[PDB]
Amino acid sequence: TYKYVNKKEQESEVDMKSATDNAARILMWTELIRGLGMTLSYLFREPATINYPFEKGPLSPRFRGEHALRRYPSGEERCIACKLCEAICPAQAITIEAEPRADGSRRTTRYDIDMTKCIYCGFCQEACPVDAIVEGPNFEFSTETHEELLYNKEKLLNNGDKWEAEIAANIQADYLYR
Template sequence: MAFKTIKRPKISLGERFYLQSILGGLWITIKHLALALAGKSRNKKELAGSGIGVTMQYPEFRWDKHLPPYYRGYPVLVKGEDGRERCVSCQLCEFICPARAITITPGTVKEGDWDKVEKAPKEFEIDMLRCIYCGMCEEACPEQAIFMSQDYLLTPTDRTQSIHNKARLYELGGTRKGLVNKWNQYK
């Protein structure tokens, strides 16, 4: 079997101690320091800062105005314009959730409520400690019943507050306008 010996290149002393990388990082830090001391740091206007640094002064100023429209907060359930539940307990969101954060117990609908709906969730829970905020539950929902909110302030004080039940999810979600497939008489 033929083989070829490959000689490794010699590493200089500067490369051995990562001098080039260290000096490059220090240069960036010194540049930001000089801009901050001159009061010309980046994002001064957007973050409502004093120009010293690029950190937002959090309790006084928040990201609400700066959030992009594609921001994914935590998942919530929504009701229709007339206050009825949109969720039909199809459990697609539970099956597609990679973190297994959603738990649904299907229930039956009272007789005469809706003609086309056969199920509604008896229990619906989302464990926010397990949720990875991926948005797959929103994409899988055929009835537009679950949405990713624009809220980012979710601070539970204990473990039980981070498990949102059906009532809490509807409270956070509110109502949503638009066509709902299960109430479409032409479907």
């Protein structure tokens, strides 16, 4: 179906009272006064502004923030050097050079994520088969140099150790959907 937005059905003819009403609308600026009243009501409403650094904006457990490498409860790193997160990374922001460790486990030696190249899409964390790489809730990690956003494995493991008390709770609240 369809409807008209500006077409009128027939006409209301010409009448003295309707003419006086239109004349008063033109001369007395009635729609302008109406708009004044609308923004006056908005003046007397309560603003939606939050006090920013003390009241943060609401979020969700699915939120994609700063990347982190997680660990098992034993303390062993979850990552098993399988590289499919960098295979699925649409920006080619991950570099996963790897070799067998001293105990023979399959681990990484270089895990770099270029945060200036990353598009923050979560494909790595939804591709990871062991929940090693995650995108935790940190978003206030702006830096004063370009180099500080070129993360390596030490930086990512430090972020994982820093945010594990929140990342684990979010994954607990979220994993039944994914």
